[PDB]
Amino acid sequence: STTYALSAAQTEIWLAQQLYPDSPVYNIAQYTVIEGVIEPAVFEAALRQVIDEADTLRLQFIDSDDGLRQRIGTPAWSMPVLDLTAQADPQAAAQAWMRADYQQPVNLTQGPLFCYALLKVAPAQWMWYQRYHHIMMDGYGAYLIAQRVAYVYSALCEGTTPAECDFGSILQLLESDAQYQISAQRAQDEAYWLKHCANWSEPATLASQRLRQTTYLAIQAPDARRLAQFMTAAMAAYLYRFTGEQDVVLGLPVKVRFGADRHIPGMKSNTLPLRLTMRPGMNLSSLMQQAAQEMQSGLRHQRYPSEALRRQLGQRLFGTTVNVMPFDLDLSFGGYSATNHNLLNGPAEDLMLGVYWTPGSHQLRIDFDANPACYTPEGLGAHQRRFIRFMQVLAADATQPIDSIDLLD
């Protein structure tokens, strides 16, 4: 078989896992509540076919005298079917089983990298459990795999045999990344990103089990990327008004493009550094203009990975990360409606700002995913109350210079 090198993020995950082998933070857990009946055998066959379709679930990461590598394997896996029909609290026992799963650490050399289970906690209420490792999957690919399984199960139970996948093999990404490693374009992106972050500083940050506090709201006064740039400028202006930093840097995850016409599950996002300078008298329109300017003069070197940049330098480049994305559309599991609920995301990038919207809807959802060693349940809640009203004063007057705004408690 042919092996492939590990990406910088994958190598960091591997070494951080081997240093703390009792750490379950690199487990992404998810469960799907299906309000209806489920055929476990057809479900297992759909899991079959999608596992072989999204071949990132077939990767095995191994050690050798030549270094960390990865290849396509035939991983040995199971699908347990637990029936919690006869318990006083079936949901509690189901949550206990799932929590007992994703709380254990996962050895990466030889071991189950994903966990698929089926929980029946009511006569017509199933729960499909999904666990992965951060070295092989993110959240978006997990949702893609969830819908592919939903569609193929829907097909197989009604006699239909499903259409071909709209997925790309992970080998595409592996080979093009191997060729990008020896690329002149990679050396140019390196030179650019280290000229750009040369006389940089620390990151402006509100830093002092993973914390979360959600807040729903509605703004009156676009598309989606204007929403992204407005939220980026607002978070940067809030950081500057709270910390007094003219130079603040935010983390912006971008979906790298290199010629893949299909979504490759497991191919993650490169979070780029966006340094905004907040000169005096500046307003929101000026800050959004500078943000667009700086991302435009950086989206051509987007392929250069963040971890390689942070290693070619001298503990992080940014403390706050802005992730603007709508909610995922729901799935149908053989005619039955199913809604996903995530138990465990990934580790903390100090602070992750999540903005979730609905098409045609004015209501937003703000998420604060913070590191507990840097925030408190009270400090994070005060920042989200402070940041949101600041953002609302910004949305009502782009004419307003950031300095003349004074926010509360």
Author numbering: 7 to 214, 222 to 234, 240 to 332, 337 to 431
What's the publication's text?
Nonribosomal peptide synthetases (NRPSs) are multimodular enzymes that catalyze the biosynthesis of diverse peptides with a wide variety of activities. The incorporation of an acyl into peptidyl backbone is usually implemented by a starter condensation (Cs) domain, normally located at the beginning of the initial NRPS module, via the formation of an amide bond to the α-amino group of the first amino acid residue, a process also known as lipoinitiation. Genome mining of two Cs domain-embedded cryptic NRPS biosynthetic gene clusters, rzmA and holA, in the bacterium P. rhizoxinica HKI 454 resulted in the discovery of two distinct types of lipopeptides, cyclic rhizomide A (1) containing an uncommon acetyl chain (C2) and linear holrhizin A (2) harboring a medium octanoyl (C8) chain. Similar to other C domain structures reported previously, RzmA-Cs adopts a “V-shaped” configuration and consists of two subdomains (N- and C-lobes) each representing the chloramphenicol acetyltransferase (CAT) fold.
